[PDB]
RNA sequence: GGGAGAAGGCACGCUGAUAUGUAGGUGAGGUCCCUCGCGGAUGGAGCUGAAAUCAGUCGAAGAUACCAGCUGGCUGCAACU
RNA sequence: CUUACCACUUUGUGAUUCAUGACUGGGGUGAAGUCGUAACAAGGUAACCGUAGGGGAACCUGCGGUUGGAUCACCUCCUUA
RNA sequence: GUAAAGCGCACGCAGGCGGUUUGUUAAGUCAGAUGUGAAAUCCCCGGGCUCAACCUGGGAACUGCAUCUGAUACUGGCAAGCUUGAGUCUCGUAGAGGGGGGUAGAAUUCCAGGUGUAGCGGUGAAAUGCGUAGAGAUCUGGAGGAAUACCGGUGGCGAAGGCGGCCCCCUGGACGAAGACUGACGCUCAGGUGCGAAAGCGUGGGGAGCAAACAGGAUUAGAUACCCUGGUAGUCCACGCCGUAAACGAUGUCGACUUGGAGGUUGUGCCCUUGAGGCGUGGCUUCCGGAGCUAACGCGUUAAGUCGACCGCCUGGGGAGUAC
RNA sequence: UAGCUAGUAGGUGGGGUAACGGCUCACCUAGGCGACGAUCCCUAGCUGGUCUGAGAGGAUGACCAGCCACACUGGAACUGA
């Protein structure tokens, strides 16, 4: 059974990144189109769409800045279970603030440097680099 | 499995009107049948291993349905068990 | 191992024992030689190599080396020992010291003379 | 199944109370039912009556006599009656 | 004085753990002991695993299992073959 | 995977984790607040003792608990759904899947009888054995018990161990093609209960072949062995017991994702089905190889790649999978 | 070390504390605790702190300070806030 379907989410985008493909089609939840609108606005992916929506699927399309993956490897870390939480001051840098942190506050799902900015902790999905 | 014209006869009487395949008391139904079936059929094959690892699959499942339903209508459920004639 | 797992049975830190049973747990111990045993060493070295059985305090009764080049030591005699595998020996565990009690220290070292010990000649 | 009553130890008389004799068993007249009297319900007279705890009290000793297993450890032989 | 609880003390029984014992099972270790090779080369009977049997010992042997064995490693040329 | 390390395999309770939508509650979660977190020993900035150790002022710390106030993205609760997950129905298909009964042929054997003469059998060669009491061979007839040629193939089925004559009876599981139905019923699983190749094992039957033990012969310096002639338990059935294995893919389960080629095999959509042919789709299966990974060999869409959940397990060699 | 425990577990009411409370009693009634490891055995004063380590963590509880406990051993009460 498929235990994390955001973990899915964002093994699809590693594997399609890895093995060039233009566009990545997964079921869609609130929470992945919500994750997908980080990435894209810091530029990870280039746009996204929701088709289907009697019975989702969401298609989101890859970047290569030439001929080289865009993203270099992205990672869950809230993973079932364990479930790692931050203070607002504890808020994880990766990569020296070069990646991201997609990080589920209650004003929303958002970036690290934005959610650094705002001063409210939360729930530390995945980082990107 | 239950012969086709006794399932017929089970579907009509434990599923409503719209003769249902899947409603979960209908289920429970053809299991049980089954299993009254194949209890005769362990009574002089003692030694069969193989078919008696589909009854517990049998078994084992209908116990699950019935966990099922007790968490939805526990007025249908507790129903259902009497008119089976389960457990005592 | 899975994070569930390891909370139902901890990790547990590989078993910790001393290389030196009896002292107690200190670094010297006095005992009374029992026996004094020239004694012969492990394959590769070829010597003839001195060593006391000796009776700690405690009433453990353990055997130690004598180092250096002279001993006067005798059966029946109170000296200092503290710890030291001696790798050529057998059971060797512990090292006598040469300046304390009876054993009556090493004469004429020049070089490293407080092993052993020998007073400064020119004091 | 046993060994096992292993071993070992405490209690025990008499008298008062709980109860002028209890719990328990017995089941009279009395009242009612009905195929209707060697009957059923029935209420509970008198009768009989165990054991306990609690108090007291006597002697050196309360299973007071008679009549009631000596115990355990190792081991030969033979299953056993 | 007296009954009540109560230390020390006593006596019976078992458990545990340390010491310890005629003696004997198995293990370790020793600058060329005796006997035979068992394995490594399909090691001269392929090795190993499982369980029974047997033997001075390595081990052999039945039965079933593996490759963690590996040697000109057969097949429709038939006309060259 | 091979280095120590995956339970032999399954079912499954407690437990861990939980598709998707909305509402709602606000437990975990975060933000703010307040009380508390004693003191110096830590830390930063000061000061003094001629410097330092040292003493010393003020802040910060003491990551926690506590209650009040808030937030709703997430996960939990709760209410109502949705349907791809998972389950269910009809029609069909393939196969040594299981259990119980019967039955047929070939062959080794044994007894019976006919013919027929001197070796037969065995090996490297040989001897023990069997034979002039008539063997071996050969023809006929009967008896019995195990196995079930060829077909058979990288084949197929099976949770695994495992299962091959044929026939019937009971019955399990998978897979397809379309329609429909329920609506998260899921995944994993300590303890647990369940299921064995094998030899072993109890009690009862059976005994044709093979065959440990045992014997005899040979080789050998021995030779308890190899080889040969015999041969008992056993193997075979019925029922009961400890559940071992190099119980394997030396690889735990389920699920998602990630270039292919060549072949087996089975359902199945389309074709003047017109070359044992062309296009379409699912199921299992096998050799090869790419990205990647691995120490390497090697794996490679059936992963040892990228990950998710849950469980097992390992921590130098010997001792020891032994002792108690 | 897998079962432990009947003043133990709950209640009622009386006695008792300075006070709640099997704290203690006599009725009652049958639970309580336990694989989230009770019970049983071994070891140990506890903490702020100290050492160490980049941190998490690991080791520890000299000294300074807080609390507990002991007072030759076992037991008891008094006086008194």
Same mark, same amino acid.
């Given at each position: ?129 | ?88 | ?29 006095? /005992? %009374? ?15 003839? @190599? #001195?060593?006391? !059985? ?36 057998? /059971? %060797? ?15 004429? @070292? #020049?070089?490293? !003379? ?10």
């Amino acid at each position: 059974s498929m235990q994390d379907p955001i973990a899915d989410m964002l093994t699809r985008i590693r594997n399609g990144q890895a093995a060039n493909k233009a566009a990545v089609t997964m079921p869609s939840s609130k929470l992945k189109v919500a994750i997908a609108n980080v990435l894209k606005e810091e530029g990870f992916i280039e746009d996204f769409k929701v088709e289907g929506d009697t019975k989702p699927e969401l298609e989101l399309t890859l970047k290569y800045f030439q001929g080289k993956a865009v993203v270099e490897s992205i990672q869950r870390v809230s993973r079932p279970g364990l479930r790692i939480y931050k203070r607002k001051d504890e808020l994880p840098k990766v990569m020296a603030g070069l990646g991201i942190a997609v990080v589920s506050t209650s004003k929303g799902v958002m970036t690290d440097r934005a959610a650094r900015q705002a001063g409210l902790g939360g729930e530390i999905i995945c980082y990107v680099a | 499995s239950l012969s086709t014209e006794a399932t017929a006869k089970i579907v009509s009487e434990f599923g409503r009107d719209a003769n249902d395949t899947g409603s979960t008391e209908v289920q429970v139904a053809l299991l049980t049948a089954q299993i009254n079936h194949l209890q005769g059929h362990f009574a002089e094959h003692k030694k069969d291993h193989h078919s008696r690892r589909g009854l517990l699959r049998m078994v084992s499942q209908r116990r699950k349905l019935l966990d099922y339903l007790k968490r939805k209508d526990v007025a249908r459920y507790t129903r259902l068990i009497e008119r089976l004639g389960l457990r005592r | 191992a899975t994070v569930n797992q390891l909370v139902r049975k901890p990790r547990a830190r590989k078993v910790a024992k001393s290389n030196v049973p009896a002292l107690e747990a200190c670094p010297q111990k006095r /005992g %009374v030689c029992t026996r004094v045993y020239t004694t012969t060493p492990k394959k590769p070295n070829s010597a003839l @190599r #001195k060593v006391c !059985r000796v009776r700690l305090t405690n009433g453990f009764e353990v055997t130690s080396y004598i180092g250096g080049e002279g001993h006067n030591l005798q059966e029946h005699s109170v000296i200092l020992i503290r710890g030291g595998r001696v790798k050529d020996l057998p /059971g %060797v565990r512990y090292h006598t010291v040469r300046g304390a009690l009876d054993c009556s220290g090493v004469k004429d @070292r #020049k070089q490293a !003379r407080s092993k052993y010990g020998v007073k400064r000649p020119k004091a």
